[PDB]
Design a binder for this molecule. Structure first.
Ligand code: NAP
Length: 307
């Protein structure tokens, strides 16, 4: 239906600039994990060519099922898809990185991943107890996975500006991407600017912020009926969700909208027949509260906590 354009990464690889999210943080009680397989299929059918997943989501198998069905039914070939997955926090020793990737690949039914990310800069033991492995060591394992051909590109997630600078100064290849939370109430303007200045593209997770339900009360504005958002939706004949995603696109970001609904999946990639003005982007930036949807504060005292 709609194929998203690409950003060309610092290693030459091209990445589609909308990714389907497959994290399960928003999944309701009535939502079984097979809906991820169906969502992946529907997304590809609707023109998506980029899927974001992670070992820790425990749904790589479903993602792989959806990919396999899309390929078998002739929607796409493997080389037309861009699959992103992530190394979990208990696999940070250098020698664990390649085997962890091979495990992800087996679950996904793939021979290579397009993008492998360090999920967080924190290292833990398998029981979530803190460890102190330097993410520079983990990055050497990432460099190895790339040299072996198992990952076409390598990047990071949840790295702050100091960590990005240290990683860049102390490695031979810098990340292609930093995947971080970006939405109207957590706009991360300085970190985005820092990454972009270094040629590191940004993937924006939890792109809908608190405009969608997070199973909490006391969420910060804007609501879905916020007058600024609904005026924008009306102006461009788009939904509020599309406005929120286009905002991220106009900041040069790769949003990762999660949906398991056929219609919303299709809406969430239909972002390329309009654009926001600089004043509109500035207005949305004014909602910033540095209030994260993804709260990892139980890890605040861990080595390399990024927030
Ligand atoms: N540490 C990390 O690197 C990290 C952290 C968080 C997330 N992520 C990634 O980023 C993805 C997105 O973040 P997220 O899972 O927090 O969710 P999100 O994409 O911010 O929000 C998803 C929610 O919005 C709803 N929705 C989707 N499209 C909509 C639309 N057009 N209009 C109204 N509602 C809409 C969804 O419902 P329906 O499903 O019913 O449509 C769901 O409840 C994750 O799935 C994951 O891939 C990565």
């Amino acid at each position: 239906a709609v194929q998203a354009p690409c950003i060309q990464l610092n290693d030459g690889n091209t990445i589609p600039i909308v990714a389907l999210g497959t994290g399960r943080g928003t999944a309701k009680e009535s939502d079984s994990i097979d809906e991820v397989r169906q969502a992946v299929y529907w997304a590809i059918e609707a023109g998506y060519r980029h899927i974001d997943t992670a070992a820790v989501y425990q749904d790589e198998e479903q993602v792989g099922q959806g990919i396999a069905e899309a390929i078998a039914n002739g929607l796409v070939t493997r080389e037309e898809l861009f699959v992103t997955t992530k190394l979990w926090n208990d696999k940070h020793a250098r020698d664990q990185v390649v085997p962890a990737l091979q495990e992800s690949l087996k679950k996904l039914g793939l021979d290579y991943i397009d993008l492998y990310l360090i999920h967080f800069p924190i290292a833990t033991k398998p029981d979530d107890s803190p460890d102190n492995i330097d993410y520079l060591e983990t990055w050497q394992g990432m460099q190895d996975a790339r040299q072996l051909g198992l990952a076409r590109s390598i990047g990071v997630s949840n790295f702050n500006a100091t960590q990005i600078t240290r990683l860049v100064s102390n490695s031979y290849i810098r990340p292609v991407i930093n995947q971080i939370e970006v939405n109207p109430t957590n706009t991360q303007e300085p970190l985005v600017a820092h990454c972009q200045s270094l040629g590191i593209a940004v993937m924006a997770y939890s792109p809908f912020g608190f405009v969608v339900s997070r199973g909490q009360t006391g969420a910060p504005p804007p609501r879905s009926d916020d007058p600024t958002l609904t005026a924008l939706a009306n102006k461009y004949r788009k939904s509020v969700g599309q406005i929120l995603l286009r905002y991220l696109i106009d900041r040069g970001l790769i949003p990762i909208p999660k949906s398991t609904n056929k219609q919303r999946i299709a809406q969430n990639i239909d972002l390329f027949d309009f654009q926001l003005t600089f004043e509109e982007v500035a207005a949305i930036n004014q909602f910033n509260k540095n209030h994260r949807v993804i709260d990892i504060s139980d890890w605040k005292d861990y080595p390399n906590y990024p927030n």
